[PDB]
Structures are given as C-alpha cells and as structure tokens.
C-alpha cells in the first residue's frame, strides 16, 4: 500500500451542522453553530491523527502538542478543500447544511472572519491542487509547528516530516510535468503551506478575542475551550517554532 493511499482511507466522514434553515440567519447564530461543529470536527481530527502512519510512535506528549498547535490549520485547510470541491464560487462549505453563500457574507462582521478561510479555497482553486497533494499537505500541516525547545521524540518527528515531504513530491510528479514545472509546483505548494501560518494567525486573533470576551456570549464546546485555554499562554510566552519551507 502506498503512503498517500493510507492517508486517503482515514479521511474523516462529512459532518452536518444541524442548522435549521427555516429560522432566519444572524452572525451570532452562525458563529455559535460553527463553534459546536468545530468541536465535533476536532474530535474527528484526533481519531484521524492517531491513524496517520508514524504519529502514534511519537511520545503521547508530542501527539498532544502537535494537535494543540495545528488544530486551526487542519480545520481551515479541510474547510478550504471542501469549499473548493463543492463550488467554483466564493462559498465556504462548513457543512452540507451550512454553506456561507453571497447573502450570508453580507451579515454584520461575517466577511471579515470568512475572508481568511476564503483565501485557502481561492489558492487551492488557483493552484488546481489534486486530492493526493491535498492529503500530503494536510498531514504536513499537523507537523508544521513544534515548541521552541522541541519535542520529546524530535529525531522521530524530523524523520516522519521528511517522509511526508517526500510523499508530497511523489504526488506532484504524477501531474504530467517536467523537472522545471515540478520545481515550480513544489515551490508553489510549499508556499501555500507556509502561508497557512499567517491564515491561522488571523483566525486565532478572532478566536482568542471571541473566547476571552464572555460578554459576547459565544459558546465554545469543551474540546475547543480546552485547546484555546492551552494555546493562549504558549503564544503569550513565545512557546512556538513555526516551521517554514522558504524564507
């Protein structure tokens, strides 16, 4: 079995938001529903990560660390892919029953939070990213940040990350290209991977502010509330090394 075929079989199933479309829309209502959906998607992301070849061989503490750092990049990247596959238009497909269409984008403060996620689906469409490249890229996003002091199984992590970089290369070679076009493709895709750090920085700014300001009455499920409570002091103390492919 090829490695990308093993990343393929563990793709999470499609989750529904449980969004009642008979009731009118509001930014608060959509944000609340998406936070509850995000918690369920994160629980599914943990089950997904545990099935990635090599991940369960890392120290349990490193498994927790990597999931705590990358959760938002995994969410935004999986959302970008689902949006890119469902429409050729500017729509965020959070769930089949909750798509942020052009009318929903006009809701107060909806666009400013949606725009960073729209960048992901725009880039995947502009770069015409394949299913195999996406799978390798999403696994690389789980391995895109480490603590500034490193991991307990750092040597093993460096070996695993290298293996999935090699996998991305193999997926690229399949796209009917020559050495010069494949050099351009690897560069373009690793640039999109690099840009995910800036996408996440912007989404986490909204996330952390919305979570800390209790007067907004924005509910976060236990799974997200726990990750956010862990992540805020780590960003505060500079405890993060964001891995980059380019400088």
């Amino acid at each position: 079995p090829t490695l990308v075929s093993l990343l393929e079989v563990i793709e999470p199933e499609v989750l529904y938001a449980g969004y009642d479309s008979s009731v009118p829309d509001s930014t608060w209502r959509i944000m609340t529903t998406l936070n509850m959906l995000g918690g369920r998607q994160m629980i599914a992301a943990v089950k997904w990560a545990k099935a990635i070849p090599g991940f369960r061989n890392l120290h349990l503490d490193d498994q927790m660390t990597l999931l705590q750092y990358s959760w938002m990049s995994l969410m935004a990247f999986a959302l970008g892919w689902r949006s890119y596959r469902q429409s050729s238009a500017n729509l965020l497909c959070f769930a089949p029953d909750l798509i942020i269409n052009e009318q929903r984008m006009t809701l107060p403060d909806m666009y400013d939070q949606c725009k960073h996620m729209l960048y992901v689906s725009s880039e995947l469409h502009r770069l015409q990213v394949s299913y195999e490249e996406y799978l390798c890229m999403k696994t690389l996003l789980l391995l895109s940040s480490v603590p500034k002091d490193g991991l307990k199984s750092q040597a093993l992590f460096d070996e695993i990350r290298m293996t999935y970089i090699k996998e991305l290369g193999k997926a690229i070679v399949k796209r009917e290209g020559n050495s010069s076009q494949n050099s351009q493709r690897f560069y373009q895709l690793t640039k999109l991977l690099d840009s995910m750090h800036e996408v996440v920085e912007n989404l986490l700014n909204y996330c952390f502010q919305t979570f800390l300001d209790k007067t907004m009455s924005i509910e976060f499920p236990e799974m997200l509330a726990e990750i956010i409570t862990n992540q805020i002091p780590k960003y505060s103390n500079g405890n993060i090394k964001k891995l980059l492919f380019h400088q």
Partner: peptide, 13 residues
Amino acid sequence: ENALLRYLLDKDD
C-alpha cells in the same frame, strides 16, 4: 490540564 485531548489520544478507537 488537557483532560479531553489526553482521553481521546489514550482511549482505544
């Protein structure tokens, strides 16, 4: 500290 995440990683799927 991160009780839920630890449980999901520790439990058998």
